[PDB]
Amino acid sequence: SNKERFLTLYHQIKSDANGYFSPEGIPYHSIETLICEAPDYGHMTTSEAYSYWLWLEVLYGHYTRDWSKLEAAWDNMEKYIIPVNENDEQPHMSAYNPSSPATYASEKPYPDQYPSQLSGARPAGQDPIDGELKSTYGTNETYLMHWLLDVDNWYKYGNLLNPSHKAAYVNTFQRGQQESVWEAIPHPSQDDKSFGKPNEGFMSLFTKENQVPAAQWRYTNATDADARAIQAIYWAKELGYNNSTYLDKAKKMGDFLRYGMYDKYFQTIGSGKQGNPYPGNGKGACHYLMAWYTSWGGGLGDYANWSWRIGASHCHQGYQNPVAAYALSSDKGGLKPSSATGASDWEKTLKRQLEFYVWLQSKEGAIAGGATNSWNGDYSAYPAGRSTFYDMAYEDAPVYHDPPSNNWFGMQAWPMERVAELYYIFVKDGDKTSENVQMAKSCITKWVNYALDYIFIGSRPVSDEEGYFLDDQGRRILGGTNATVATTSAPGEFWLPGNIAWSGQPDTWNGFQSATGNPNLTAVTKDPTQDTGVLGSLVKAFTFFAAATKLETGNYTALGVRAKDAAAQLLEVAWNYNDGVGIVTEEEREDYDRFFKKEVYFPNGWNGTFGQGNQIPGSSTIPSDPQRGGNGVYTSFADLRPNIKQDPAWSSLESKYQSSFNEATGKWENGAPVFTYHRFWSQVDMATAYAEYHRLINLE
Ligand SMILES: OC[C@H]1CNC[C@@H](O)[C@@H]1O[C@@H]1O[C@H](CO)[C@@H](O[C@@H]2O[C@H](CO)[C@@H](O)[C@H](O)[C@H]2O)[C@H](O)[C@H]1O
Ligand SMILES: OC[C@H]1CNC[C@@H](O)[C@@H]1O[C@@H]1O[C@H](CO)[C@@H](O[C@@H]2O[C@H](CO)[C@@H](O)[C@H](O)[C@H]2O)[C@H](O)[C@H]1O
Ligand SMILES: OC[C@H]1CNC[C@@H](O)[C@@H]1O[C@@H]1O[C@H](CO)[C@@H](O)[C@H](O)[C@H]1O
Ligand SMILES: [Ca+2]
Ligand SMILES: [Ca+2]
Ligand code: NA
C-alpha cells in the first residue's frame, strides 16, 4: 500500500530515535555530520529543509485530519529561522530608505578579488513595494526565512539577538561565482565584531569602505525555499486546512517574497545591456522572476541607525515555483495577499515563469540555466549575439560556476515536478485553454519524454569512464531526441541521470507563438547514479503529469501511461532501499579532496579569530594565485574548521585521502570516499512521492 509506505517513512523521519531532528525539534540537513554540498556541515539546517518539513506535515495532516503538526512546524520555523520576534532581530529596519535601498558594489569573478569596494558607482533605484508592505502589515520587518542555521552552534558564534537559542544565524557564501561551498568562510549573520578581525568582524573580507565597518546584521533568503513553503500551504488549503491564523502567515511570506523579483540594486531591467544601467522608477527594476535571493541588513547598537535591501539580478530556472505564484495570485489558488499589488505582481510572475521555462527548453527537452540583468555582476555589456529574455542575458550557469549551477540533474526534477503539479492544478480548476496552461503543458510534456530515455528500473545502463551514456554500438549519446541507451539486466536496481553538460543558447525570446524549438541549445545527459532524493522528486513529476493527462482527456495519454508506470515501478524498486531510517543508497564523493585542498582565500594583512577559536588564516597557507587577481593566501576547509577533526567520520576520510588521493595528479587512484547519507529533504521527497501516488493515482 503506497499510503502505508508513506506512513512508515513519515514515522521513520519523525522518530526521536533516528536523529533527523535536533533536541530543540529543528530538522537537520542530514543525520550524518560529515557532509558538504551547499550547507558545509550536516547539522546546519536550511530554509530548504524547513520547506520540506512543511510539505511532509501537510500530507500527513491530510491523511490523519490532524493539522496540529503542520502548525507546530510553522511555529518552529517562525521561532528559529524567520528573524521576526513577537528583542528585535532586525534592528533599525525602520530607518530603511526605499529611495536609496543599498550602496552599489561590483561582484567579482574570483573570491581572491574581495573585498569589493562599496563605491556607490551606480545609484540604487526605487523600491516600490516597501510602502505597501508597511501599510499592509504595520512593519517592514522581513517575513522570510534566513537560509542557513547552525542548529548545534557548531561554529560557536552563539545567537547574539536571541542568546537562549542554541540555533544561530550564520552565513557562508559572499564572494561570487567561483566561491564554491569549499571556499567560503562561515560567519555570524549578527556581527558584533567579537569574532573575526578585531574592530572589523568578518565584514572586511567581503566589502571595503573608507571607515572601519560598523557592527551590523544581515540575512539572506533562498527564494525557492520560501516558495516551497507557500506551495505546501497551497495543498494544505486544497486538502481542507482552514486556519486563517496560518493561512495569513503564508500570504505575508508571499508578499515579502516579492523582494526576489527585483534587480540587486534596483536598476532598470535591460538597462545594462550596453553596459550603462540606470536606476529603476516605479516597478522598472522588477523582472517578475524569482532571483537567487533577497538580502537585508542594518546596524547593530545605538549609533547605527541605518538599514538596506538588495534584490538579485541573476535568475535560475530551477528556483521558479509557479505553484506558489498561482496560489498567491488567483481566487482559486486561495493565498492572495492583502497588499495593494501583491496578487497582481504574482499573477505576472506566474506567466513570466512559464515563458522562462519554454524559452529555456533545449532542442531535446531539458531546461537550460536562466538569465541575468547584471552581466558579470557589474552591469557589463552583454556579449555580441547573446540571447535575451525580457532584455536579460542568457546564462548557462547562473550565479555559480563551481560547480556550474544547472549541471545537477536535481535542478531538472525539482522545477519540472512543480510544472507538472501546475498542469494538474490548471486542468482540475477547469482551465484547458489559457496561454498559461498551454505553456505549462507543452514544457512538461516535452520534458517527460526527454527524461524517460534516461530512467532505468531493473536494468543498468551502459556508460563509459567519463560518464557518457552509450548506445548499443558503444557510441557516446551526445544529447538529441530519441536517445537509445544500451542496458544490461539488473533486477532490483534503479538508475537516473546525474548531470547535464550544456552547450549553445536558446533563441532570443519573442513570446510563446514565436518560439523556435531552440535547435542550437543542447543538453548532454550523463553520469548515471542512484540519488533517492532526485528519485522521489521524479516520481512526483511523473505522477502529477499522468494525473493531469487523465483529467484533461478522460484517460492517461500515451505519455501519461508511460509516466504513471515509471512512477509505480520507481516506487516499487526504491522500497527495497529502506534501511529502517530512510531510503538510501551508497554514494561516492570524488569531491571530498576539497576538505584538504588549500583554496580558502584570505586577503593580505587580515587576521582574526574564527568561531571555533582558531586564528585565521593562521600559518598553514600558500600564496593565492595571482592569475585570480588577489593578493593573499589560501588555507584549507579543514584548517579553517578544526573541530571537524573531532567528527567520528573524520579519521576514515583522512585515511582514505592519504591512501587513495594523488595530490600530483589530483585523482583518486584507489577509489573515492563512500557514504550512505540520510538527508532530510531527500527523505521527504521520497515519502511524499508514495503519498501523492496513492492520492492522485490509486484513489483517482
Ligand atoms: O541547501 C539550500 C541551498 C541549496 N539549494 C537551494 C537553496 O534553498 C539554498 O541555496 C543557497 O541559498 C543561499 C541563500 O540565497 C545562497 O547564498 C547566498 O549567495 C549569495 C550570492 O551568491 C550571497 O550574496 C548571499 O550572501 C548568500 O547568502 C547560496 O549561494 C545558495 O546555494
Ligand atoms: O558527488 C556527486 C554525486 C555522486 N553520485 C550520487 C549523487 O547523489 C551525488 O550528487 C550530489 O547529490 C547531492 C544530494 O542530492 C546534491 O546535494 C544537494 O545539492 C542541492 C543543490 O545545491 C542542494 O539544494 C541540497 O541541499 C543538496 O543536498 C549534490 O549537489 C550532488 O552533486
Ligand atoms: O552592496 C550592498 C550590501 C551587500 N553586501 C553587504 C552590505 O553591507 C552591503 O551594504 C552596505 O553596508 C553599508 C555599511 O556597511 C551601508 O552604510 C550601506 O548603506 C549598505 O548597502
Ligand atoms: Ca523568529
Ligand atoms: Ca572556485
Ligand atoms: Na533568547
TrEMBL record:
Disordered as annotated region, ranges: 85-130
InterPro entries per the UniProt record, alphabetical: 6-hairpin_glycosidase_sf, 6hp_glycosidase-like_sf, Glyco_hydro_48F
Keywords tagged on the record: Calcium, Hydrolase, Metal-binding
Alphabetized Pfam families for the sequence: Glyco_hydro_48
Binding-site positions, Ca(2+) 3: N243, T245
Residues binding Ca(2+) 1, per UniProt: E78, I82, V84, E89
Gene Ontology biological process terms in this record: cellulose catabolic process
Active-site residue list: E48 (proton donor), D224 (nucleophile)
Binding sites annotated in the UniProt record for Ca(2+) 2: Q178, E183, D402
Record has Metal-binding as a keyword: yes
Entry superkingdom: Bacteria
GO molecular-function term, one example from the UniProt record: metal ion binding
Name by which UniProt lists this protein: Glycoside hydrolase
